[PDB]
Amino acid sequence: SKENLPWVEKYRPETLDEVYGQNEVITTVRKFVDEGKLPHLLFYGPPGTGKTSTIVALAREIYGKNYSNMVLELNASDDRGIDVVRNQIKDFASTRQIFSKGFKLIILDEADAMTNAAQNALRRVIERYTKNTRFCVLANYAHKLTPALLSRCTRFRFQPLPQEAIERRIANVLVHEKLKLSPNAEKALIELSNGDMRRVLNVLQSCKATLDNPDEDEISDDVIYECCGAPRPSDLKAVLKSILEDDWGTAHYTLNKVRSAKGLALIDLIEGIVKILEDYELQNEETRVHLLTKLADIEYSISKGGNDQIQGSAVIGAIKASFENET
Amino acid sequence: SKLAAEQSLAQQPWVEKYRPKNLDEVTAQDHAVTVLKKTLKSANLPHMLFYGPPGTGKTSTILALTKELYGPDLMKSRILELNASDERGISIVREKVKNFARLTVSKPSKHDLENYPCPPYKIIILDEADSMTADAQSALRRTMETYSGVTRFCLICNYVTRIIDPLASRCSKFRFKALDASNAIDRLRFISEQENVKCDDGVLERILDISAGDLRRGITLLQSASKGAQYLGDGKNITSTQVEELAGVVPHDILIEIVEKVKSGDFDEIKKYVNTFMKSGWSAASVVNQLHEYYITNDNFDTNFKNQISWLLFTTDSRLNNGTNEHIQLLNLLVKISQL
Amino acid sequence: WVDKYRPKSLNALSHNEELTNFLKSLSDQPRDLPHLLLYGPNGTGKKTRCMALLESIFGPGVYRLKIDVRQFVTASNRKLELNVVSSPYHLEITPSDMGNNDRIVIQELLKEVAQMEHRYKCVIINEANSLTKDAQAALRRTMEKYSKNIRLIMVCDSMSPIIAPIKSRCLLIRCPAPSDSEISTILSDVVTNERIQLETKDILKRIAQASNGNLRVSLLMLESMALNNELALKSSSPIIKPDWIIVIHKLTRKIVKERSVNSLIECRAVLYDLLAHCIPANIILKELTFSLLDVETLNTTNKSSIIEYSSVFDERLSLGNKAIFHLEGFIAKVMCCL
Amino acid sequence: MLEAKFEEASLFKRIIDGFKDCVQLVNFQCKEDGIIAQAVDDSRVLLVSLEIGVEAFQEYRCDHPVTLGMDLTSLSKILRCGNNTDTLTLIADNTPDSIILLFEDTKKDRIAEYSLKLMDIDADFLKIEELQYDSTLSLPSSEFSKIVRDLSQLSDSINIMITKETIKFVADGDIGSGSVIIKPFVDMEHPETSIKLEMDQPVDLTFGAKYLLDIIKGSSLSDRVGIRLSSEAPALFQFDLKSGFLQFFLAPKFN
Amino acid sequence: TLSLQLPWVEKYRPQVLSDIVGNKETIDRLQQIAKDGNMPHMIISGMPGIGKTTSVHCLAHELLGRSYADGVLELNASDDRGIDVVRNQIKHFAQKKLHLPPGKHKIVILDEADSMTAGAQQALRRTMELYSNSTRFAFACNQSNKIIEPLQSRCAILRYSKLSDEDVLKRLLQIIKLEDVKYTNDGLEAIIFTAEGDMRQAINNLQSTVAGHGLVNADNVFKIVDSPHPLIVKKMLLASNLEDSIQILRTDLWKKGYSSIDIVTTSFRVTKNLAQVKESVRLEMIKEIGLTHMRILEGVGTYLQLASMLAKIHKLNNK
DNA sequence: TTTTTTTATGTACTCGTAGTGTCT
DNA sequence: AGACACTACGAGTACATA
């Protein structure tokens, strides 16, 4: 049953009308398929944007419910070498369908992990067998693909999910589940997503689990922040104010009590302070240079461990010394 | 059978003796275990990614969850645990993990379904995912994406940055918080009472203060203090000084001597005192941490001096975190902070 | 000799009485014993104290040990040959005898010893600082999965390269270097047992003042200078210094005397000759910097820059593999500073 | 609970050897009427459809429809563990998992118990293809396998042409060319060596050499193989067994 | 939907050497060679999508006439091209007897010659030397340096260059005239700008824009095909003030879904191929970009790291 | 003017014992 | 019943890596 799959897998789009966020590419692909001219596609974009769902729904719309048989789907989980290409992909492209009549579809998902020799062998397979089969390459990084292979396909960039589409999907989930969500809670949820539907679905399931109730109540900002462990804008701005204006010992005490009262992480506070200070209209760019350099150094040091108190004091001192040049 | 297990636990160090067996034994990581308890009644366990400081209870939490889910019978048949002591290249991830994921779930017995929920999926956990190469990690993407109906993936790591972005997006991120005195004093007091650890008033809270968010190190220090107090047999209570002596903490007077040598003194005297101090074995990380605490906490230095001392201590800790020579780094730090 | 007069039990130790009492406390109940990590200066006597603690946990047969060989196969057909020190109660492994293949030996050997098993078999990991981060990560879970059959006693000189999980997974025991007085008392018993002739006792103190807490170096230097004075130490017996220390001192003299590229070439040659004779580059850098700071011709401004450059290039060497590539850079930076 | 008992244990071996090379994973559907199996090649060029009725099973008991997903490189190893004069027993519990094979000797007393872990194959395989073909021929399996193995050495593509009482197998490569032409005759002295051909319209289409070589591996099952060809339709290579059949739906190469 | 139509790159693929709008010199050279005969061993190198494979295909077709099927041996990177293939099949084709006109020769076309192993390339030397009177070799590669010098010594070297604006514009105008498409000057200009001398990519983008919107206008081309990635990165690095570069990185690159690895790689490539600034400042910028890439590869890839990289680049440019 | 620098998977070659269909 | 050509899958050995 579908009630056992996680929310990321349960709510996977099955038709092209359930893929939100991407409109300029979805309409163009629908027109390509209706008019017949479907070229070799290259879906490039960040994780969680809906490239795999888009191509799966496309193959479903093209071949019907028997998609799992008329399409050759290869990914990084499967062995994709040059010999694998030579045998499997060439035998698939050269032959025809065993279930119906029509062009074939080869979905090379996550093809950014393929060997250079494999791409060099495939770039002539795409150019030779082009009247009976098509190629779809999904990628997160366009630098791992050879320029020859990159030039044979039409590139579609999957933009991050905007506010309207992600709110539409959230409303769809809140309709499918016996769940209510606060408006400010929804805004905070959209803020900690960066256009990643996977994160939204995961944390929505997690905060529904956090409710502890038969779901007769609502999900507020407190639930989201306590479940995702993300700092609140209130505590963020309080720490920033105490760092910018208050005394050194008082700033240290404030940072300690804020990061220990809710169990917040220093890296999340660093990213939040970076995001907040990005809107600050500042004087001569030397302060911004020092701030960015020191904050990136502290983040790279945190990414390897160390003393949290020493790193917090380093953040405080870096912000203070950077702002001391603004006078 | 069970009695042999009880005796082996009783003859085991306190770290493994008091390992959380149920989801209720987790004292401080409540946000994660609440979701884990709620999904225990349902059947929609998502792919999870535990990350946080070492000794926060990630492995213990996932072990307790798998136990409460499957029972001691299906505990050994529906679990695939891969640690850092095994090979986890592309070949292993493609063959073994994918063959276990593609396989069907084992049939539960009649006694299993009567006491445990027995979900229709199995669990593949990968402990210490920081050592996994990014290509072997990307190989797991579709493996965990397509076979999610029959298996669930649980990644465990300390640095969440070492895991690629797609894998971090596919799994639900569970951040384990540091176990300071506040949220771990109850567990430490329980461990002390269960072992009849007669201590003073401010010992346990001090132990965690030395632990810096690490319950395993705190339990080890408590066990060492209890052994040292039982060997003496005086019947007195453990003192905070006796605890900080065996914890590697530099005494207060020796640190005040370092502060005096830094404040007043030239390069030669500081170098000589550092050479003398390095004879007595002290961890440079602890000395740097104590100096940082003293300098930032003392309300007798200028803010301009405080920015510089904080940046210098940060640089010294970042250099020490790479396996450098403790003597050279400590001498350089003290010399740089003496010029201030 | 160092080996002829060495303690074999906890009651035979003659310095750090508090450490001996802590070891006796830790060995009172031996079955509920967690993993241990002995850290401190090199030459203090931690490897003797670990064996003395094993002598308290087990019978006196712990010292009757044997050397065997075990072969391993990596991802290729290159055969890894590793010798093992084994005892009927414990075993000792030194992963510092190979390159990046520490993880394989660690995981395979420890899993074999843990699957075969007072009731547990002790494991002594010698020079844990050379353990690569991947080998330490592999040992991280092996330390916890098998805690009723395998207990680790890791001997190291500095916990700086040891990862935080391993640090947390074992008790930490510091071994401070013995005072000059205890070293002098030990040398006194040694010279009365080896029948040496001392005109004045204070020379022994000077030996301590030349060893910097090292007992292994102290006894060896005492015996080396006892052979030059023909078993009769006088009031002004010269101090026997190792050859590499003299080479480093001459290198510092050359550094402070001439600062040029022509001298940089011969400095690189001296560094090559030192590295080719089984001398680590970190110790070379440490001794070079410490003996350069002792140069009275320089001032505080020069010494501060020297120590900063030495810390920077020590980080570089800990992050690199071509050691001379960092040593020559540090030497050039010091030349530019002076 | 699935409980099947074969008359000869080597028939299942010969049947599985047919799919051993051209098919990786299988999903046996067991019902009250018999065992059906449909599988797709890794390159998805051929489709294997095996059907064995309850006539082959010496004993058969199927309480409810059972789905057994398994691997063939392990089932073949389990089957080779048997014996030539033994009997085979397939057992599966109410919930399909860890199918059990039992080899029992009929001359002596011997019990060989083997297990096989099932696998959860999400892709269903229930498709049936029942459409009229343009030509239906029948020829000895050995005679067809000989021509296939002889023409596979010349090139990688073998073209089949069906005309008015003429069957032509052409192979053009780099070292030369070749073409075997046969005529449908009726052999009264031996019926298993005759060649029948019923054609409605001439046919001309090519296959690959590897799949055609893998198909003829099933010639050890029956003494005669049927070939159904049509205009751009999966060619039906059928070996009829005394309790069912094994049919390969092969996909030609576009020109 | 039942079937698709042939793309314009394959449908309008040139079949005669006159239809090629590539490098005029080499095109007339190959045309005169096909007219007179005596085709020598050749190696055609260049960049993807400029008319290398089509050129050799047209040459072989025009030179062999109807004997193209039995006189031309095509081997691509999709086929095995190891030592065994060169030893057996190529040698059997070169030794094969074939009655040809007194001005033609058997042609062995080897596409993607830069991917052949060293053993096969070494064995091909005497293979092409002993049968150089009845068999000729034409290699088509992108990097001539990947082919060993002994092989290059026995053949002519034809280096194809990028296609200027005029040639691609003329070819697109011919395609539009042959297809009756509604277009505009600014749309074709945007197409050629996004093509970057890539004729295949230009025709592909044109066909995609036609099938997606019908009218080839700059707005449609820009909404269906984003601006070239290296140009925005160059404009970001060449910024004079830190805030402008930060806003460019935020809006153009980070808010559009470009990964940090792609951004840092494009920055490295642009700084390597930069010519506006001096050598020392370029080396310092490359050093900083590599220092940033060392953190991006370790999994610390975020917007803060790129912001710090831009800040350090500006500090270097801040004298 | 002169020869080695770890691990890590992809690629290519060869010898190689081995498993089975065919011939005096 | 058997001998040995044909053969295909498995351990060994190197060779690159923008």
Ligand SMILES: Nc1ncnc2c1ncn2[C@@H]1O[C@H](COP(=O)(O)OP(=O)(O)OP(O)(O)=S)[C@@H](O)[C@H]1O
């Ligand atoms: N545009 C979208 N509309 C609705 N749901 C979406 C959308 N994008 C992602 N999702 C959800 O996120 C899940 C994962 O989507 P995927 O297509 O697998 O992500 P992706 O774009 O392929 O990125 P990868 O796989 O990490 S490279 C889907 O099953 C949906 O539940």
Ligand SMILES: Nc1ncnc2c1ncn2[C@@H]1O[C@H](COP(=O)(O)OP(=O)(O)OP(O)(O)=S)[C@@H](O)[C@H]1O
């Ligand atoms: N939240 C907790 N509650 C109770 N005991 C805990 C908790 N966290 C850690 N412990 C104790 O510490 C021991 C180690 O737990 P682990 O789960 O292995 O720690 P960890 O998070 O895995 O650290 P690693 O493995 O270095 S990342 C457990 O057996 C417990 O005795």
Ligand SMILES: Nc1ncnc2c1ncn2[C@@H]1O[C@H](COP(=O)(O)OP(=O)(O)OP(O)(O)=S)[C@@H](O)[C@H]1O
């Ligand atoms: N000079 C040209 N004139 C006309 N069309 C051209 C020209 N060059 C390329 N094309 C088009 O681009 C398509 C592919 O050209 P190719 O020759 O395959 O590219 P290439 O120069 O060989 O680069 P590769 O194959 O990626 S190494 C042809 O089918 C034409 O449609």
Ligand SMILES: Nc1ncnc2c1ncn2[C@@H]1O[C@H](COP(=O)(O)OP(=O)(O)O)[C@@H](O)[C@H]1O
């Ligand atoms: N308590 C002690 N009394 C006398 N000698 C000691 C004592 N501890 C260590 N030693 C001397 O130290 C020597 C061994 O040093 P070792 O332990 O190998 O150095 P490290 O601590 O660097 O491993 C022995 O020869 C022994 O004589």
Ligand SMILES: [Mg+2]
């Ligand atoms: Mg995907």
Ligand SMILES: [Mg+2]
């Ligand atoms: Mg763990």
Ligand SMILES: [Mg+2]
């Ligand atoms: Mg080409």
